Structures are given as structure tokens and as C-alpha cells.
Write a protein that binds this ligand. Structure first.
Ligand SMILES: N[C@H]1CO[C@H]2[C@@H]1OC[C@H]2OC(=O)Nc1cccc(F)c1
Ligand SMILES: N[C@H]1CO[C@H]2[C@@H]1OC[C@H]2OC(=O)Nc1cccc(F)c1
Length: 340
């Protein structure tokens, strides 16, 4: 590997560990913001577009109910998420600007990304051409090189978690399942269509599960649908562990070869997890036209720019029932969330 890549990753790890060992806490409060619109929801939390009252800047505020986090066994995962987000720094990761808690909730306030989900644009167009898919995939390869060098596993890659910014580049969001791992880890988590065989089989697993999920993502971007699907998760799991996959005839031979090596059921033979690491991917024939430095420096003109009117436009997100953000007059679950 070139010495400039080695020195870049060594400095990146030094800066991450300084923030990891001394996390920021309590850097705003709720009545510093005005609420604008709910951007979507979940079982234990929501994301809302908000405006900061002094500066006028827009942000995306993720709100988690402390009692529901405890009930759904997500305490350690919520603490991982905020500790990792406040310590990372890379061109294709969403930025955490503030965090705080109150009697009822935890809050993570991130920069707002007005182009919306990659998934929305994929379904509007049908499928991405191979040059368009390759522009997005190169950004994910560089982001995993960075996260894996910090001993982090991401564990939720899918098109709904990749937002498109005002220059047409990716911002990765949702670190709810991310974790710092030396060696192996064991938690069953993720989305069914994207799970590697070793997660389904309850084995001890490692960063190779993120390279499997990159194979699922590139297939989905280039075909318009993922490689393994069915009405019941147990049927999806049976197709994943089987060791077979069918490719559309319009795929190039170079694309098929790359996908057979990422969607490799034996984790000890999978690209990204061999002696040469990420360079088996960067040097594959499917990426021969990619300028890795130009992508990192954001100097390549993007294939597509989202249509929106300004920094507070919500037209690329969809519509949800608007509910209260209620805060109890008594403190809930204070012990469990002391470090947040
Ligand atoms: N389809 C699901 C999943 O994404 C949607 C919808 O529910 C929640 C929504 O999440 C967001 O808008 N998050 C978000 C995070 C950071 C910045 C930003 F601008 C938006
Ligand atoms: N969406 C996030 C990330 O890019 C924006 C925004 O936070 C502020 C900016 O920080 C960066 O450009 N970070 C960065 C730049 C060069 C090298 C590197 F390793 C990280």
C-alpha cells in the first residue's frame, strides 16, 4: 500500500481515539429548536426536521424514548451509536452537531440532507446504469476502509440508509447497529435481505459481513431489486445460505465476477476479507475507470443532483402523522443512560 494511504489511516485512528476516550455530552436543549415536520418513524424513536431559533440553521433531530429503548433491549446499541457518531469524521458520513437528554428522551441532532433516501431515487428511475452504481459503490468502499481501520463494523448497509446531498454525493446515516469490535461479535441484528450467512447461522462474525452487504447493495442498484427476497424471513434465509444467485442478462461480465466474490458464502474466501483486504476490491476490473483520489476529494461531477428549493425543503421525504414530543415531569431510566 502507498505510504500516503497508510499515513492517512494512522492519523484518522489517532483523531478518532481522542474523541472516543473523552466523549462530548449535553451540548444543547429542546427549547433551542422549532419543530417543522416528521421525516419518518420507528418502533422506539422518530426523526424530525427542526430549525435552531438563534442561528436559523436546519437540522435532523433523532428522538428516542428511554423507556421503549430499555423494553426492546437496545441500551448498549443506543450508547454505541452516539459514542461512535461524536468521534468519527469522513466525507461520506453524516455529521453529529449536538446531543442531549431530558426526563423522557435521548436526542441526536445531525446535519439535514435535503435530497432524501437513495432508495426513493432508485425506485423512481427503475435501476441505475453501471457507471451510476459504480460512483455510489466507490464511496461505500472508501467509507468501509475508514470505519474498519478504526475497528468499527457498520452492520446496516441498505439504500434506505444512504442520503443524497446537494452535490449528488452519499451521506451514510443510522449508526444504531454500529459497534467497536476487536476479533468477533455475536448479536443478531440488521435487515433480513442484507444479512450474511454467518449472522443467520448464529456464528461469531467480523467485518466480512459489511462486504457481503456491499454485494447485496450493488446488485440492488444495478438490477432494481435485491438478489434474495420472499414473503417470509425464513424463506429469505434459506436462499441466502444456499450458495446460489441468478444475474440479469444486462449485467456486464466484470459486474458478475465482482458480485460472485462479494456474495461468497464462505467468509474465509470473500473479497474484503483476504490477505490484501480492500485492495482486492479497489483493483478489480469493474472499478478500472474509478479515480479513487478524485472521489475522496469530491472532484467528480455527480451523475444526478436532487431537485429541491432550499435548505428547509422536505419535498424528497414523505408524510407521517404528527405526534407530540412529550417530556415527563419525573426522570425515567436515569441510571441506564448516565454516560449519554
Ligand atoms: N424510510 C425511513 C427511514 O428513513 C426515513 C424514514 O423514517 C425515518 C427517516 O429518516 C430520516 O429522515 N433520517 C435522517 C437522518 C439524518 C439526516 C436526515 F436528513 C434524515
Ligand atoms: N458530512 C460531514 C463530513 O464532511 C463534512 C461534514 O462535516 C464537516 C465536513 O467534514 C469533512 O469534510 N471531513 C473530512 C474531510 C476530509 C477528510 C476526512 F477524513 C474527513
Amino acid at each position: 500500500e502507498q505510504e500516503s494511504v497508510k499515513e492517512f489511516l494512522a492519523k484518522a485512528k489517532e483523531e478518532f481515539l481522542k474523541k472516543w476516550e473523552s466523549p462530548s455530552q449535553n451540548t444543547a436543549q429542546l427549547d433551542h429548536f422549532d419543530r417543522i415536520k416528521t421525516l419518518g418513524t420507528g418502533s422506539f424513536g422518530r426523526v424530525m426536521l427542526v430549525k435552531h431559533k438563534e442561528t436559523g440553521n436546519h437540522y435532523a433531530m433523532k428522538i428516542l424514548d428511554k423507556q421503549k429503548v430499555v423494553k426492546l433491549k437496545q441500551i448498549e446499541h443506543t450508547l454505541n451509536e452516539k459514542r461512535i457518531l461524536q468521534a468519527v469524521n469522513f466525507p461520506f458520513l453524516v455529521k453529529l452537531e449536538f446531543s442531549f437528554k431530558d426526563n423522557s428522551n435521548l436526542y441526536m441532532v445531525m446535519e439535514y440532507v435535503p435530497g432524501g433516501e437513495m432508495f426513493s431515487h432508485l425506485r423512481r428511475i427503475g435501476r441505475f446504469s453501471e457507471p451510476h452504481a459504480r460512483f455510489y459503490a466507490a464511496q461505500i468502499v472508501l467509507t468501509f476502509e475508514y470505519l474498519h481501520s478504526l475497528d468499527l463494523i457498520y452492520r446496516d448497509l441498505k439504500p434506505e440508509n444512504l442520503l443524497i446531498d446537494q452535490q449528488g454525493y452519499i451521506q451514510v446515516t443510522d449508526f444504531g447497529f454500529a459497534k467497536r469490535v476487536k476479533g468477533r461479535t455475536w448479536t443478531l441484528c440488521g435487515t433480513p435481505e442484507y444479512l450474511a450467512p454467518e449472522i443467520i447461522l448464529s456464528k461469531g462474525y467480523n467485518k466480512a459481513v459489511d462486504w457481503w452487504a456491499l454485494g447485496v447493495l450493488i446488485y440492488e442498484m444495478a438490477a432494481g431489486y435485491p438478489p434474495f427476497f420472499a414473503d417470509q424471513p425464513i424463506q429469505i434465509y434459506e436462499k441466502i445460505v444456499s450458495g446460489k444467485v441468478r444475474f440479469p442478462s444486462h449485467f456486464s461480465s466484470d459486474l458478475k465476477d465482482l458480485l460472485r466474490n462479494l456474495l461468497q458464502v464462505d467468509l474465509t474466501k470473500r473479497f474484503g476479507n483476504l490477505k490484501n483486504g480492500v485492495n482486492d476490491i479497489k483493483n478489480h476490473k469493474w472499478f478500472a475507470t474509478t479515480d479513487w483520489i478524485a472521489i475522496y476529494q469530491r472532484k467528480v461531477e455527480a451523475p444526478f443532483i436532487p431537485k429541491f428549493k432550499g435548505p428547509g425543503d422536505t419535498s424528497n421525504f414523505d408524510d407521517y402523522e404528527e405526534e407530540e414530543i412529550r417530556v415527563s415531569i419525573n426522570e425515567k431510566c436515569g441510571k441506564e443512560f448516565t454516560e449519554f
